Amino acid sequence: SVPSQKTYQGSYGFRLGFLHSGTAKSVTCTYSPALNKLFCQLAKTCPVQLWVDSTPPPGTRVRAMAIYKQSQHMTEVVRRCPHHERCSDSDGLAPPQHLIRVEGNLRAEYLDDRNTFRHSVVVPCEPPEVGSDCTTIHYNYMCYSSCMGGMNRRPILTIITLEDSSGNLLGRDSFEVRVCACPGRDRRTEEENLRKK
Ligand SMILES: OCc1cc(I)c(-n2cccc2)c(I)c1O
Ligand SMILES: [Zn+2]
Question: Impact of changing residue 77 to A on the protein?
Answer without folding.
Answer: In sporadic cancers; somatic mutation
